[PDB]
Write a protein that binds this DNA or RNA. Structure first.
Lengths: 96, 62
RNA sequence: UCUGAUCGUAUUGGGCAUCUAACCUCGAACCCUGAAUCGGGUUUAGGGACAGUGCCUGGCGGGUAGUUUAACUGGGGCGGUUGCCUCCUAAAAUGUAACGGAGGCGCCCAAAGGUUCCCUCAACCUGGACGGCAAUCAGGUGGCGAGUGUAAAUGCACAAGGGAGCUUGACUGCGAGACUUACAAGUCAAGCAGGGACGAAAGUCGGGAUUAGUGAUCCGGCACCCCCGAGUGGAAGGGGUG
RNA sequence: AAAUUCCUUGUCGGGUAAGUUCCGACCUGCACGAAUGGCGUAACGACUUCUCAACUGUCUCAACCAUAGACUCGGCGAAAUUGCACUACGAGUAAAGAUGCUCGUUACGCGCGGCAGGACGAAAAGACCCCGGGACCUUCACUACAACUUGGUAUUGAUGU
RNA sequence: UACUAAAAACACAGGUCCGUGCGAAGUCGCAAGACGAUGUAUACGGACUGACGCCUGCCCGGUGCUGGAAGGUUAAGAGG
RNA sequence: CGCGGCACAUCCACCUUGUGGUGGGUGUGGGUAGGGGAGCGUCCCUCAUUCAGCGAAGCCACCGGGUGACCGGUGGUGGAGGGUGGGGGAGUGAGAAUGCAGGCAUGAGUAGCGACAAGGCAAGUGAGAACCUUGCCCGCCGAAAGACCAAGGGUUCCUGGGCCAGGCCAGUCCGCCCAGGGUGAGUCGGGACCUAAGGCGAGGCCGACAGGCGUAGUCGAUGGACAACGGGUUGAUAUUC
RNA sequence: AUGCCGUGGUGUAAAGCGUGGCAGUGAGACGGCGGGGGAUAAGCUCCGUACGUCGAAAGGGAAACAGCCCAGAUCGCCGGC
RNA sequence: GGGAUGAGCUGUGGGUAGGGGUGAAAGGCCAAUCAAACUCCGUGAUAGCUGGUUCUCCCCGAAAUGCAUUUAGGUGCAGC
RNA sequence: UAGACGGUGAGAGCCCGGUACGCGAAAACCCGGCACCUGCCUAGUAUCAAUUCCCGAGUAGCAGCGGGCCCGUGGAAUCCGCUGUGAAUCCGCCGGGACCACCCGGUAAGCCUAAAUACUCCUCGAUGACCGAUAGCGGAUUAGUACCGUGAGGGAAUGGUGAAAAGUACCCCGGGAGGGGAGUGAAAGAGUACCUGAAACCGUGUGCCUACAAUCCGUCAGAGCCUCCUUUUCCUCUCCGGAGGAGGGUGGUGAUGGCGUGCCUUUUGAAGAAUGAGCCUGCGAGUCAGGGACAUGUCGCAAGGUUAACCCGUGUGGGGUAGCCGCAGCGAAAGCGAGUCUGAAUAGGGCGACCCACACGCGCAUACGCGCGUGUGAAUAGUGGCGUGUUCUGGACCCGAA
RNA sequence: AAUAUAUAGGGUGCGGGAGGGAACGCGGGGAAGUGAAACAUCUCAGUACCCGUAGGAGGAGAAAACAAUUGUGAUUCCGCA
RNA sequence: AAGUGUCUAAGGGCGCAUGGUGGAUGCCUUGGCAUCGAGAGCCGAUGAAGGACGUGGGAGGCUGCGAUAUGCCUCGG
């Protein structure tokens, strides 16, 4: 600064810590599934990365964001409850 | 050749999902008897960085 | 069987003495030196498990080494000061400096807080034994001079002063919305929920009549919450709240 | 009253005519003092300081002469310095002191020899002061170290007590 | 003190005090190994003073040196 | 205010009725540090085009031109690489740093011209002479301004020859330049003989290493040992022949 | 009295606010009006003013003159007020 | 002017070398410089200070004020 | 299959030396084929039991003082060295971040090991949007020379004649040098002191002004001379010319008057008696690397975009998805997820979602717009490259301290 | 040999070494300036410099290694992370 | 008698013409800086790197050379 205690030292250290074992998952928006696959047919990791909607070499979760009408089973992991509700409301099925 | 990030800045400031920076206020770690629960409520939280120094901070973290 | 004392006995060390055996001996003699007083070796004499040397540790340590040793400042120096609070200077919103004028603070309170209820002092005059104009008592004047925990201001008689009963809100989880301010930081907050003291209730209370009574950051410690737990289960350590 | 005394030329007296110095004495020692040595001491000293005979151009009070320079003539031929130039003075103004600005006065252009008042004259990035930075130095400053030093263990045993 | 200061500074003789019993202390060196010295307490090293004469007074409280080790405090180690 | 010319914002009407410009009107236009926008010029590369020994560039002068950084043309010198345009890329624009390297000025034909020993004259050499030469006077040191060694210098000695430069002037001469010649040792001073102070110092000790000290042995003179004296000569050498 | 906050009309090419990028300033002087220190002082010094000017502004006038008075230069004119 | 048979002067040859040497001590002398010599290397060191920064045009246009400073001759945020 | 450069009297494919291209090895030497030479091997494989033995000794590990590992002694792993104590031989040992147990991986304390990789004094060949003699290394020239310093070390400046030397024979001044006349040469304006020959500077000639007058040394007014020049009376000598004169007009000088305190730096304030500059010439100071970072203009694509390293290939083209930014955030984290967190709940509040000129169906509303599906086309984006301005680390605008 | 073995030493003979080398590498040693607007911890840096000692390249190396159940299976070097 | 009244340059200034010194700009290079590709990546007790000395028909330096001395022998072009 030039004459006083820098803002860095002045302020408190931000609380908390970072885990080393934070197995972060990628995100698939079920609405994006709706517009991407209105025909249903087949859904899976390979197809999603083939479209380029999600990163490779990682597990994916499904969001409750979006109106789902396409009746198709989804091959993926760690669906939220709202994802299962939307999936079975359309008439599809979750994997694990 | 390759940039550096000011460590203390990285250990005090947190960038949010958008273009905002927050500060953990914690003038509440030394002496707390004369400070009431009211003042501690005032300090408690993560307030937004003042716009009179974001223009410096963003280069401190980047 | 507080087992003093104590037989000797397992252990152990210390101390002491003695002994020679490592080791030392610019102590002697001889020899590879007929070219040597260095050196190395044989034998002998004497010191001796010491000392010295390596490791670890305490201590003395300007002999030597690297730096600091503040600033403002009516030049410097000496002197004196440095944060916070209150008044004036301040020019009638606020703000507004000077080695310009004046004073306090680095505390206090489980009652001097909160609540309900009640009262209005001082100074003055009259009368009054111990008692005096100078404690106490009555009467009359007296709408605030007294008082305000503490400096000063500002306000307080509707009383924030005084007296008394019960009590701990001297709480928890939040707090829209503002002032002020470069920033950090400070200040106020109706009102909401829990639960509860007071109060017949309506209602007040998230400390002191408000303004000073304090000090950011890092690191570390205490209690609690499985929050994580370097293969795993645990643990350490870390994390979160006070 | 001094190598030691600011108040102070302290006071008395000789020395001088006249002595803030000197010599001698008192002590009212701001501050004398015993090995960071006190008090004396013949001889000594390119030391310091006061007085005196003699002489003297040190002055009164300056003057003359000679010599190598200066000056001229011929030859060789530098330099520091250097904002420009056809470089007056006074009273004033102005960043306070003006050649350069205003109003006035005065001077024919040029050139040689002398003086040295000025041009904040030249040579030097103030050699006093202050601030910042660095060196060096001392120490009951702080933190470390070498060295000397203490203890234990090993090198290192036995016999006894 | 060449290159501003030659002195009232320095230095010696003399006088005191302290240390060392000998590959000594001290110093130079990390050690070896040298000096000190082919010497050794009437010698050597260090400090102050500075012929000669008269003299050199009192205080060990502070800070240092030296001797002691009652007692307290006191690290590592052993033990734990 | 008037009479005229440029410019930026804005208003209005047109061209793509803001790509960007065209026509008109109002108001605006001092400005340092400093922000923004558009520009001038030099060198090189690429592409296209193009002048040029019937004379390019650079340079000098002249006449004109743009609002500016600047340009064009004409003439002369000189004699071989440059112009126009769109692009790319910069060691890119000097007026100062008591700046650097080079060159040249003022001061200035001034000061200074190098001990308080002293030169003078005649003849001669020579284009030229106070300074060299040959004669003759005068003057000076004479325990040094004389004569010899070392150290040091390292051809500076001699002869012949030259006088652009140097010498604090000139200067036929010189310790300046060129060519050539010249230094003779059993006995002088050194090695062939040792040695002191002291250095190297295998072996050896110590030290992480590099390395340090030091014995033997060997080096190291101004020292100790060791045999020579006089005279003559050449342009020069001499206890040397 | 001034001054200040806020509101409603009016007038003015337009200033302002928030948001990003790049700088400077962070020594100020004098004069006018109010004030303290100082002596009723200073070309003194420390403050205040939505007071100016210089600084960064040329020109006129004050004899000359950075700070006062008038006056804010786009350029040219042998034109006026 | 002083010493000028003595602590003398001088030549030859030798040693001591940098936070070290030497020193009849002055803080001088060590290749004209010494309160730590010289050359090179790290080095293109550093400096809150000074000094210089090269061609033009057009528009617009500051401050010397507050808060904080091992700070007042600097810098940071704010103001313009 | 020769247009690569260069040389040759001015710019060369065909003039030359050369290149393309194709030849060329007695002797030596590196690699390489073959022979000799050299050297290993009269099998330990299959099976079973595990009573026996081994599997790297003053070592490991442990304690102590340290280094280094993101890791500064901190709870401190593993690795290394030093000092004392001092293990085991597979039912063992080490390690897996103090540590114990389980699980897993692997068997230290002996040795050797090519490739990928780092550098070019030095030797051929080649390039260069690098300089072209104050630059390039300092060294194009007697170069680490001369020179400075006892020494370690420091450390200069000087290029160009013309294609060819054709080097001015001869003559004349002059002591010579030097010069002149002739002459060579295209040119001597190419004479060893030599291409072009700048500026400061010195100097000659010449038009104008100047010896009674004070001012940064100029500007604006401005007289009269002088150079040049057009029209014209006129000289009619006139089929010539502008002689001279008037008038008019370029370019000098500029009598005399007004006006006006030099640049820069730094300063509250300067022409300065505040600093720096003697003049000229040349040189000399804001730039570069990095898929750095924020913002911006513009250009590719489009929920994408983009490759690095490395490979292939020849002019720098094509491959190459490992990786990065964006794509969902909050939260200390578990974990949850268009919500999430704190928290008893959250009514509240922190971060982020989704803003309609609005129709269909429809709750709400007189009108004004809220909402769920479809839609009157409702609101929309980053990424990569090249410049700009800034900034971090790199000597970082440049020079200079002790 | 010294003293008896015997050894150190001595003697004879046969091989190799030292020193140079611009840069690069390995092992060992080891500052300050500077930054931190002071400054010791820290950095600058295990750099400058030095010593040892090779090579044409060297060094390292063939698991008492990683991960933590997809498992891989010597080293070195570049780019990611 | 009074009044009007041109002229001079010892030497400067300004501008032109014509010359000197000096050696800058322009074009050039027998010379260099930095790089890609390919070799070589060592020499030396067999006396090396590097040097003094000395050698040529005629002063001296560089270059090459070493009492066989700007060279000798042999096989090659």
């Amino acid at each position: 600064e030039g004459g006083q205690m820098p803002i860095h030292m002045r302020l408190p250290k931000l609380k908390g810590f970072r885990n080393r074992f934070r197995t972060e998952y990628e995100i698939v928006n079920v609405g994006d599934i709706n517009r991407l696959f209105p025909q249903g047919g087949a859904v899976g990791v390979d197809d999603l990365v083939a479209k380029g909607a999600v990163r490779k070499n990682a597990l994916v979760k499904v969001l409750g964001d979006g109106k789902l009408t396409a009746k198709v089973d989804v091959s993926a992991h760690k669906f939220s409850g709202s994802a299962r509700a939307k999936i079975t409301a359309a008439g599809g099925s979750a994997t694990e | 050749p390759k940039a550096k990030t000011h460590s203390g800045a990285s250990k005090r400031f947190r960038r949010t999902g958008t273009g905002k920076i927050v500060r953990q206020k914690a003038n509440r770690r030394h002496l707390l008897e004369h400070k009431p629960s009211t003042r501690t409520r005032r300090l408690d939280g993560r307030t937004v960085v003042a716009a009179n120094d974001t223009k410096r901070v963003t280069s401190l973290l980047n």
